[model samples]
Target chain A: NVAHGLAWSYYIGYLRLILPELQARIRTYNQHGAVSQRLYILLPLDCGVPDNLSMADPNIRFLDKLPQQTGDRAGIKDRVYSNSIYELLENGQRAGTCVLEYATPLQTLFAMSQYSQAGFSREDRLEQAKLFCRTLEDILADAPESQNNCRLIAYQEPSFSLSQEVLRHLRQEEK
Target chain B: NVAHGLAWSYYIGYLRLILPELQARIRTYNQHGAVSQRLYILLPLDCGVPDNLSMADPNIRFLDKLPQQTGDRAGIKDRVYSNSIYELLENGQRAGTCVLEYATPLQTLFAMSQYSQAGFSREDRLEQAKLFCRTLEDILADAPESQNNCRLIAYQEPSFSLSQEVLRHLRQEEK
Candidate 1:
């Protein structure tokens, strides 16, 4: 269920709706050239699929307790993933995921390190992303079916790397 | 000293008098594009230094005891820094110095990870910029330090690689 929740965070508003507010917000945020921000709120259960979720809290230590006032809202918070954040995660999907509308076209042309912090290979960040996804899958698949009722539903807007060059940077298969 | 400071905060406002409005609300805000903010206030012992200084109930974990506030009059609190604040030798010529300012910008950039749910890389982030600078230095020295600072001082101003490239990719090296 948690995995479902996490995937939906990337899928719902980020991959599907493509929130305008996030795009508007991106106009003012340029830390990652050609990158944008997108975040969504999701129902704990949508369409009856068990939701998988990742944990990425600014306030909380990695895989630790929930942090205080990390977000304006009352509960979980999410942000766009960076190369560094991706590497820190046991799994990128497990850590958490937010979909951005897209990465810029020229961002596509730049080397992977140009798009993200250096000292890390793009393969590493992508592996974290996919592994985190699998981590969520394992956690959800192993849980008791009844526990699925207790699962949380949430939304995330992903700024999926639009540049094919950036996407090309993703690991072709698990390392 | 100045080069080290510039290497640290990346941007430095001129050393001058600070207004009450700026002084009272000094803070580092976090968001998608959070930055570390600090004031490097340099005061002289001559006619310019305020006689009294106090802080408005500091929330900062470090440097709580530093002289922050200044009232209209002079007193024991006013001269506290002459002895307690500055490192003084036998001659009392202000042997050591204490200038209040934010830590370097690179350190502040490292601080942004404090706001992320996922972990970050201080060295790698700095490396990205450093790599860019290494390439740029071949053409220019003392590279325009405040370009990114000026670009992001406002809230939520986003930068895209393609657009930036179209505009001045030639003028400024991406490194």
Candidate 2:
């Protein structure tokens, strides 16, 4: 599962709990008056790219790779990934999807990767959840694209009970 | 003139001074794998939006507006602006350009508004110029769009000797 990359499993449990919150905040964010017809989402490795695109095509070009940083805690690296860009398959017979990575403060990102329901007290858990969604909102604010759809994947250290506890909270449909 | 809006004159001198530096850094940035076919730029109000688009069109929608903040010094407002989003004209016979603003830290932005060639001694000027370009680069890093074009507008406190001095440093070609 760790090998699968930043998939939904990493973010799913924590994310589901925060979905309602993110939905509300993201809507308010998109209201900032810059409407993008194109919905730019944080492409989760698990979600896969749009159906038409291929990874090996000549059109696919390398975008960016942030320096992998060790979070304040040893053994917990900020698992930032590569950015890839290509045109969408439109009129010119091509529409590529860029695997745009979210860039923000390192510590904030590190804090966001945690599971909200895993261990915090009621107050702490709610605050943590808000921090995570706020980080995403911050990402939206940072980008030129719109979060009309805030679809995303999460990162997790699989064996951690935090994610396991997160699983039980999931509604069956989300499971 | 101050009331006219965040015009080109405000950023012209500082921008021009750092233009070459920005050009180089930005090219390096765009190369970071996520290539955007759609060019996104920091809209300088003075340059005007693309001729095909109109600010008044219903097609234009509000995207976002960051809260105005006082810069570190009193009376030195960040002078941030409203964000508007709209559809771009293609087959639908509409193309909209967003007044996409750059989002980054506030203090960095304030420092960038200063002229690179104006008040500083030679060493200080180069360091300041790099800082300015670095801020722009940081901005490019933050946005989801490609800096295929590093075009931008600067902010200046008119009537300050800083800006007046910035004016004289402009090369004739820039004028």
Candidate 3:
């Protein structure tokens, strides 16, 4: 976590702002240009277009709140979107886990499963998913979060340095 | 914060295992396509390593114990890493804030000020920033937040999402 701490420290300007000369040192370390960075964003595809956008015109649907006008406009890759991660059960046979593929700057692709919205029961871990959806929906609805992809846009810049990796091992799935 | 909470829901998969129907709607919304997604890595630019990059030498570095393997290999853009917004500072800069930029298919970019790291004893905001960095680091370094980006090498991608607007905003010194 130290790496993330350090990285966040830098990104958050903890070290650079708090310490004297560390910024310069950081600059010196970066002078060689061997360092690299990665960025991520998570949002629903086919988002409701801005009120200004029109259903008749595809661009107008989400025109004011599109990547073209927001963070995506920056042209940064490593995007995360939600679409077909659910199974279409019933009648035709659409019941199963929804899988979506993510392509990255490394030219690598990954498929992840999504959750159902109805199954939210505040009684347990499942409630978390509901909270998750709520979070996304909130962003979709709010101009600050939705427009220009403001939140996702800012978090993906600086690279974190580390001490040791102990994060994954620490998390426990709720039963 | 709300959008982030939602992203965490997906990151933790709290919804997928719980709410199945909502996931379906999302899928349908996606046109039966995968959920839109994006990932970002903060690499310090204007640092020590802006010049040399190689396939043999990975661009982004991760904690040893955590699942730092998910993303794609760091591109040259990933090489610009350091621990401060001051790295991007120009002409007596100060203060930092994180902002989101992109969101289509969830492609994104994150930017914050190096001055964000500034702190003074008894200052609540500064302390909060410290705590924020600490908590984020601990969580990220431990288990990669979720099963996705923490361990998969293919999850890595690189890009320069900084825009003239953000750059201009970032350059402004905070009080």
Candidate 4:
């Protein structure tokens, strides 16, 4: 049941324990007002799915077949996975869901783009997602895109924006 | 006058006010015990540079020329910049020093790879630096690489690791 219950628990445990730290990392950066715009990702926990894992037509792409060393331990080799879901979305919009073969707070990055909407169209999500993924992946690989390379994929946008609503609610609650 | 005294003060004031926030962000992230390997960036203040600015070959590239609306204001158009500095390093190793066209605490991401030493040459620093940049950049950009796009440039690795050593000293002195 590695892909079922146990694996699910591992994912959940990783989210429960590590997600906040990652969020806090972003939050702290924001609190410091480092950048004007903010970034984030979605997990199995974020999707609110237990029996339902992964999206329909979920296509996961590996940056490369080669195993790169994880910075945590000297000899631990890990592969990176980005979900293939362009056709998964309706309209012209797309999103990306990426994860490292290993489970760590620093191992995953994801993004969504609403093309049907006014601003979120074209390669916006994909390009931005690449910056998000490639940079992190590069960091994990300890090389540049030229050295440790991979192709990035973008999925179709969802009916509702997870971050949009989340950020809106945060503003409301803050007030 | 963009690089003049007023601009310098703005930059200096930014560094003075925000460096602590960035440090606290890293510190808080470390406090959570999320990952043993931490990450960060540098401000002009950190370099102690008043008279000098930019690099000798500061040919920074922008990911895209399109003006994506800044999530903060009505009409703020921003772009990310990457440098071309691989040839600048002494040894075969390199680093990245990327900044946004605009000024914001979160606009910049930098990392150095000390390949003259062992273990440093194997693309580890670049990957980790990407992670450091991408994660924070992702937060600011919101979605993924598309919306928050920028060019990344590698810089020369200094004699010793400035961040790790600086952070280590901070921890020791704080204790």
Candidate 5:
């Protein structure tokens, strides 16, 4: 019973503790009209074009979103984005709307695990990150000026530095 | 007076508050005997060899060292290192010692300022960091196994993100 409670604490502490702080930070950035340092847009592996991207105008899209609730399902990663919607506007009218989905924390973490086990070099990982950055920049080249209002932001990784814990859990699931 | 006090708070809050946590973290990693995730060793620009590296024995070196006393001098930046010492040992005996001095926070901040004004891309900065990582790795190829005990660990830009205020200070200084 004691062990269960402790495990429960670790699980709860992981998500609940960080969600408020992250949201508060996002709110602060939005309130201050500060632009985000890094921004990301998802490019689907199957296709270079993401499913949610639309080139039209007068659209409203979220650059980043926080989970409304926290639980076992709640996971977060640094700079990894999802559910960001972008709306293009032309002549005071909505032309097109697009939702950007980038790799989430879980997916990125999984990728990192595979990459590490496969002995991928630091340059390799960095190259991948740079590719995503380039893709986002490409998309932003034609984005509406209002899209500048959408900041790309990230928080510190909440799971701490050790990637082993997550990797261990994943291996167990696979078994 | 208000501005001075606020600046004072920011300065103090930046280092004093974080020093203990960082030292504690380093201590924990050292105890675990685990190789650090991200490690750095300062190599001098003038010499292909670092000032304090050895091909011989057990030695300790600090890749990054914070200032002994923090005041206005406590400028921090992304990858520049300074005052990092390396001790070399031979046959389980003290052999020689060396120190590798790279860029200090101030130097790095200045470079960053120039790069930003010059409109350097993320890939550019990343490429620079990768180059440094490769250099350190090359130096490590001949390093002793005991040195493996020393893990150079850091998170996304040591000094804990939010380079804006520091950049503002830099701008003020330039003015």
Candidate 6:
């Protein structure tokens, strides 16, 4: 749990703005190489896309209604979505309009789980995260003018130092 | 903060096992396509690579010592690393052997911040996360006896539903 706390504290230090689409196109250093980051969309509870909202807005979507979503309901590999309408309702999110959310750099780090076969060591992956996040933030610098009103959170705080935990947090020390 | 809370609670429902590298090579439906997830390395504080550690090990690395790390100390773009020795210590992590950590799928979703241009909508991204997570979990099915003590956390809990919040969380309704 100390590890969990530290991880939690680490991310809490960074914050980001959320969006459905990205403004910058990724420039892969290696075509076969890829880096990944995570995000959480802060939608209001039970906020399903209005049936017509999706038709009118190219951005909003209800993937649960897609063919692949219902095509293999029993396939363990291709089952359900975390953001599905049924999921929101199952979790008791109210039926309403949704909201947007973003991430901080530190939060982005703690939240990342990139899969790579392009030979990235864990260290290599984090190096990639640095660039990946810079790009994410690069776009955020434009947030104030977007008129889109979807504000992106920034991760420059450089906070979350610790002294903060019990001595044996890792207990590996006891070893 | 209600939105943040809900986002938090939502991911807490799924758990995943973590690893430094992926066992499966990605089978891209689109060569230019990519999906991302987030992870926290539950490292034991103060664990620096033993002087001989990196030489002896092929898997572990300290990206902070890489040339790119120092070469661009002045570059706002490629400056410092979050996992640098300076960083870990600054965060008050102890100096000793490090520990390992993993993520749950829900946590993975909440942590992702992939910057895509291959054209994935928010719903599209979530669809990707579903497949991304399944593959992640797929590798875990092999974990029961990996000999490596690093245990991967699973996110199949299907938990974290809510009653859970008060109204007016997203008073855009008041609009």
Evaluate every candidate with DockQ and list the scores: 0.02, 0.02, 0.03, 0.01, 0.03, 0.02
Query: How displaced is residue B154 in candidate 5, in Å?
Result: 22
Question: At residue B147, what lDDT does model 2 achieve?
Answer: 38
Q: Candidate 5 residues A89-128, lDDT tens each?
A: 4455544333223332212322332432223243344344
- Pick the winner on DockQ between candidates 3 and 5: 3
DockQ-derived CAPRI band for the predicted complex in model 5: incorrect
Fnat values, candidates in order:
0.00, 0.00, 0.02, 0.00, 0.00, 0.00
**Per-residue C-alpha lDDT of model 2 across residues A1-175, encoded as one tens digit per residue:** 1111111112321232233344344344446322212222332212222222234133433332222111111111121111222233333443333222221121122332342311223334233333444445544443333334334334332222321221222222133
In model 6 chain B, the worst 10-residue window by lDDT is B161-170
Name the candidate, 4 or 5, with the larger lDDT value. Answer: 5
Residue lDDT tens for model 5, B148-173: 32222211343322123222322343
The top-ranked prediction according to DockQ is 3
Q: Please, what is the TM-score per model?
A: 0.19, 0.22, 0.22, 0.19, 0.20, 0.22
- List residue ranges in candidate 1 displaced over 4 A: A1-112, A115-117, A123-126, A136-175, B1-175
* lDDT of each residue in A1-175, candidate 3, tens digit only: 1111222222222111222332233334345312111111221121211111122122111101101111112222222221111111234342222111111110100111222321323233223323333433342343221232112211111232110111111111111
Greater-lDDT candidate between 1 and 3:
1
> What ranges in model 2 sit over 4 Å off?
A1-100, A104-132, A135-148, A158-175, B1-163, B168-175
B1-175, model 1: which lDDT tens digit per residue?
A: 1112122112211111122223223331122011212223221111112222212111111112232332211001111111112221223232222223221232323332332322334435544334323322221233243222211110112322222221132223223
| Candidate 5 chain B least-lDDT 10 residues | B72-81
User: lDDT per residue, candidate 4, A58-133, as tens digits?
Assistant: 3322221111111111111111111111111223333232222222111111111221211233344334333333
Number of the candidate with higher lDDT, 3 or 4: 4
- What is the fnat value (0 to 1) for candidate 6? 0.00
* TM-score comparison, 4 vs 5, better candidate: 5
lDDT of 4 at A106: 15
- Per-residue error (Å), model 1, residue A172: 29
Q: What is the lDDT of residue A130 in candidate 1?
A: 42
